[PDB]
Amino acid sequence: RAKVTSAMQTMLFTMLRKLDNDALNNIINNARDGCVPLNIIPLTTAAKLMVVVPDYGTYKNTCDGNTFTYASALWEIQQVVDADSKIVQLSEINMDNSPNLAWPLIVTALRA
Amino acid sequence: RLTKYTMADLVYALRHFDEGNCDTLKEILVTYNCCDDDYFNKKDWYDFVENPDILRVYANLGERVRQSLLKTVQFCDAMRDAGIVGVLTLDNQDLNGNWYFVQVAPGCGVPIVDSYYSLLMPILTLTRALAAESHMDADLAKPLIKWDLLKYDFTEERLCLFDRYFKYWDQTYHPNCINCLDDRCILHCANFNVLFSTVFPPTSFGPLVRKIFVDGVPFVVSTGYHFRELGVVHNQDVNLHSSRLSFKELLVYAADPAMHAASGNLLLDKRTTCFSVAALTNGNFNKDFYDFAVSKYRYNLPTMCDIRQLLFVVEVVDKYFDCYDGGCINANQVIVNNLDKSAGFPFNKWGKARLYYDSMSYEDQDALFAYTKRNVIPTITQMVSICSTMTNRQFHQKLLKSIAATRGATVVIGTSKFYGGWHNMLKTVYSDVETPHLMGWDYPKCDRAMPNMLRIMASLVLARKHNTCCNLSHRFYRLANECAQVLSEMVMCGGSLYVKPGGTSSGDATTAYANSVFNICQAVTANVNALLSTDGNKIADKYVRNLQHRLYECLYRNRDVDHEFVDEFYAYLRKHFSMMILSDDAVVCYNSNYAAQGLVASIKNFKAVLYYQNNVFMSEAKCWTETDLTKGPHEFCSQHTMLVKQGDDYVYLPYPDPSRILGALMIERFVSLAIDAYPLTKHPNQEYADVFHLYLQYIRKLMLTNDNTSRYWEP
Ligand SMILES: [Zn+2]
Ligand SMILES: [Zn+2]
């Protein structure tokens, strides 16, 4: 039992270090009674956003250029990694080079 | 200045749908510009799986449907003020919502709307009747409501809709199902919540969380859950400023997505249509056999039910379950064989179910079970974890084992085909039907598109055994727990957490049984509809003529359950519509002399019922009718049936398709294949017999003999 107990505690504390922040306090403090839906916490506490894009047209309407808007925030792209785990530059994502990209691409961005 | 068609014709066209005789529906959709005429030249234009665009087209009737509901409420106020007492029907209201009864006293009237709304209910989520209500003043021509993300209750919003559209539905409504007096009331309210919830944000639903503290350190945990069907359910055993967490509390928290999603990455996934919450991050080919042989959830839609019918059918469904035993068992009474099963995320990062069953004492297992009778734990599954399965067995296993140990019953789970079992099961369904024919059918998307309302009905049926061990509040929390754990749980896919819209779960304890409750419900519904939809004045048999009359009056009148009527109706179905049911697999032996008159359901009733009950179209390609009982069902338990001589008598034997068998302690697998192939040697086609013999040669080279195999069919 002890092995499991330790694993659960280790995991919960790792998450607590990530979780305990000002953003969490702001969403809970704005609640009428301290209760919020879980599905809206990441929209306020996640500083980092993962965007998964299946093709070029979607990319243009999702993450065109250095910044984009999502969850009522402006996001700044830090990196793009393809389906083969290679680094792709923003300057490399265009119509002409679309056939050479390992779609879907995953875009990593931070809150502006 | 009335329209050509009435609300009754729209409801009939959608509920008694036939892709052949679909002229009423096609004309209405063209007439009101839902689609053009060329729309009906598409292959399978009426399907929901193929050509999913049909939903866009049905939705174009949504404004028309809410206008009819609003006109009804205004009509009802007018007749109330006028002192008029009477009944509202769908053939007295046209498709523009226009209306066309006795007087008692000014200010004292009352509408009867029980059939009025129940008949419409199945098409209100189909046509998106409340599509306008997501807009600021409930007008599609204006912008959407900027709903507060932190709003999680919506009690007032549901009450406002209830009193706007169903004002005269004179039955107590409990937006939060936790306040229901019995299981019937639970289904009564949930049915409204399904429709009302269609206009609330997707983020407003799901686990509800709070900041709590342990040793001064904040955690985000679930302290309740918001269900699309059940409303808001709060937890009671929520303890803040604790010093340490117990093993049990740690299991509850580890399983709780509140800790994982709130602490993860934001996720925008454009590859899907499903709602996501957070990212948590940044075959065996048997060549030897082959060479030897060669040498020789996106479719799960909110679905509203006809409640007057659902509450009748469920009593009939319960009768079909009035032979087995059930109730609650303790932790030390639970039998678990699959201890090699993954414990589920995050427990599967540490071990298999054995790791947890051998760690918790029986007292701790009982305590976790008790927790779920007072609170809700919204666990995480992966594309069902131990914090769900450890307690689902204590609640359901006695019943599941009872069903599995009972032979001769309508629901047959766990009954071997061997030693005459196939034969006995067939004789059991054939029974004494006067003019027997055999029928069977598939269920498209049975594990994906099954509505949460029918999943709730099935879990309530399985829970109806808990009468001498559970109070009302406890039964409700157990329902809330089953719903949070298998209908709207979190599922990890890859490294991210997504929300499941509904359907079934192959990892749960009850799926194989809940599916049989469902199969009966749909069949009863088909028979209730087959009889109620026919002309009662064309029935020569006075008995059935009276049965149809009384059946109508046991659904839309006489709300209290008439148990004598239900026993009689049940017996009627038992005699003329005999069912043999396995999880999503059924054979029906029916009396065609009555089906021919519309007094018994046929395949066309199943097609119409699945069309509006599960939002799926059932193709004739997988449906069958067999007129000669010399041969058995075309396919049951994925096997074909033939009558052969055995013991200077005749028996029915199953057999799988010969190509499927060859396409399929390694020797143990081959022995099982050879046994399944054995009956093929009784078949007149030598090519079938050769499958069995091929395996014996392989097995012996890897002792299985003809005698060690023929014994499997000797009682
Ligand atoms: Zn209720
Ligand atoms: Zn009980």
Residue numbers in the entry:
A (entry chain B): 80 to 191
B (entry chain A): 118 to 217, 222 to 403, 413 to 426, 456 to 542, 560 to 840, 854 to 891, 907 to 919
Question: What's the paper's own text on this?
Answer:
The nsp12 RNA-dependent RNA polymerase possesses some minimal activity on its own6, but the addition of the nsp7 and nsp8 co-factors greatly stimulates polymerase activity. Though additional viral nsp subunits are likely necessary to carry out the full repertoire of replication and transcription activities, the nsp12-nsp7-nsp8 complex so far represents the minimal complex required for nucleotide polymerization. The SARS-CoV RNA-dependent RNA polymerase resembles a cupped right hand with fingers, palm, and thumb subdomains. Although not previously predicted, the SARS-CoV nsp12 contains two metal-binding sites to which we have assigned zinc atoms.
In three-dimensional (3D) classification of the SARS nsp12-nsp7-nsp8 complexes, we observed that a portion of the particles appeared to be missing the nsp7-nsp8 heterodimer. Further 3D sorting and refinement of these particles yielded a reconstruction at 3.5-Å resolution, which largely resembles the larger complex. However, in addition to missing the nsp7-nsp8 heterodimer, this structure also displays a significant amount of disorder in the fingers domain index and ring loops, which play a role in template and NTP binding. We hypothesize that the binding of the nsp7-nsp8 heterodimer to the index finger loop stabilizes the polymerase domain to permit template recognition.
